[PDB]
Design a protein around this ligand. Structure first.
Ligand SMILES: [Ca+2]
Ligand SMILES: [Ca+2]
Ligand SMILES: [Ca+2]
Ligand SMILES: [Ca+2]
Lengths: 19, 145
């Protein structure tokens, strides 16, 4: 259930922190 | 935002918080980044955490994580964020996410995913019928609901 989106959130989080 | 979105972000948070103690340490963040193919240094990890460490305890708790993710960016910023996220999933960088790439990333992060599950994901997302997911197709899945 929404697994792809969930991983997407985690990946975007790393992006936000790197910026 | 609302309950559903919060619960979703909480699951995203759990991918980092490996021990379930409710906080993301530099070690945990490092473990996740390494699983994605990155090699951050200790200094880099501390800086990342420091960006959202409002209480100065050296770790990212859920409230801090949620605040980070709830922040509304400009369209331009959102677009670049999505592209950066896409590159993480597009392992070989050929401009398309394959079932092999998607399952590998998801599994490495901590998600449980079978071949049939990933097959379905790719199928549903594949709009142009080439058997893979390009950037805009990726955007649709990320923005879906
Ligand atoms: Ca933890
Ligand atoms: Ca903190
Ligand atoms: Ca690829
Ligand atoms: Ca496609």
């Amino acid at each position: 259930r929404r697994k792809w989106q969930k991983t997407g959130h985690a990946v975007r989080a790393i992006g936000r922190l790197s910026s | 935002l609302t309950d559903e979105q919060i619960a979703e972000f909480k699951e995203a948070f759990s991918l980092f918080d490996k021990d379930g103690d409710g906080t993301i340490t530099t070690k945990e963040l490092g473990t996740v980044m390494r699983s994605l193919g990155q090699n951050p240094t200790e200094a880099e990890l501390q800086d990342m955490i420091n960006e959202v460490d409002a209480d100065g305890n050296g770790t990212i708790d859920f409230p801090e994580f949620l605040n980070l993710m709830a922040r509304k960016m400009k369209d331009t910023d959102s677009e670049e964020e999505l592209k950066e996220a896409f590159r993480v999933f597009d392992k070989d960088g050929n401009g398309f996410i394959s079932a092999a790439e998607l399952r590998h990333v998801m599994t490495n992060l901590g998600e449980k995913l079978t071949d049939e599950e990933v097959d379905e994901m790719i199928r549903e997302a594949d709009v142009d019928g080439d058997g893979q997911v390009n950037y805009e197709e990726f955007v649709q899945v990320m923005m879906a609901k």
